[PDB]
């Protein structure tokens, strides 16, 4: 009844402490949906895109520790918008296990500093809206301190953005997501 993709920022601007906090966040969300019919998929992005597991992969082995523990940081630039496009066009597709009539949810974890992306958010966000894709944004690092990165989290998040933008250290993201599903 819900298909949840994580899209995690692994650029070199994410320090190692923050990247581990992304893995722990992801893991805690998956553990909490364990007694439910939720399916998960994850992609890491920088200037390249690695699909760590598809919805089909999770179907066959729904172990958060099996899939999330070996994830290693990619480094490189930050192509968040192209990352969003590749999620809606490939990971939310039945070939990768996505169920029609499930609620589509994308959780983008980033420091809010897109760099090196030939796509702007205006090229990918309206398309994600036209697919059924509800977007949550989890900010790490300095994201909430600068006006540009704050704007970036607002631009990604579905609306009202205050029910979709959260910080990685709190449980508020997972509390809102549980309550909405």
């Amino acid at each position, epitope marked *: 009844e819900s298909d949840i993709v994580f899209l995690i920022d692994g650029s070199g601007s994410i320090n190692n402490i923050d990247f581990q906090k992304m893995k722990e966040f992801v893991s805690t969300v998956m553990e909490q949906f364990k007694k439910s019919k939720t399916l998960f998929s994850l992609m890491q992005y920088s200037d390249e895109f690695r699909i760590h597991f598809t919805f089909n992969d999770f179907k066959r082995n729904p172990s958060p520790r099996s899939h999330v523990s070996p994830i290693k940081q990619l480094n490189g630039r930050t192509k968040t918008a192209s990352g969003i496009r590749k999620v809606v066009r490939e990971l939310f597709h039945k070939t990768n296990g996505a169920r029609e009539n499930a609620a589509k949810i994308l959780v983008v974890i980033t420091d809010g500093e897109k760099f090196g992306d030939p796509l702007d958010y205006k090229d990918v966000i309206p398309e994600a809206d036209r697919a059924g894709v509800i977007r949550y944004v989890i*900010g790490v690092g300095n994201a*909430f*301190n600068k*006006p540009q990165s*704050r704007r970036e*989290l*607002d631009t990604i998040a579905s609306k*009202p*953005a*205050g029910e979709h*933008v*959260f*910080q990685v*250290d*709190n449980f*508020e993201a997972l509390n809102t997501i549980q309550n909405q599903l």
Partner: nanobody
Amino acid sequence: QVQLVESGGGLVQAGGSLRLSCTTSGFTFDDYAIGWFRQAPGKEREGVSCISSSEGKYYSDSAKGRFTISSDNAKNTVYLQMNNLKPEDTAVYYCAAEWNNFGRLCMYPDYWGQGTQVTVSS
């Protein structure tokens, strides 16, 4: 019950300075980060500043270097000291409160005051 009451607005010349006050009541003060926002008619809204006991202070690009936000925790009041004011800073200034455990530095306030007018003339 919940109140966020701006004062200290009014007319000042360019180069001048004003101190806004946001006196609050009706909620536990320490549970909220408090910020200032502004809007003139015909102009886009802007965040200005925010203060949180856990996340520190935040300033917009226009505010940074000129403006100082502070909190009198005993009186549940937040001040915005605004120096080097300009005619382009003419706007209705609102204070706002956002639940601090979100950790967002006032990005999406839960409560808003009525706003008070600030006019900057040459």
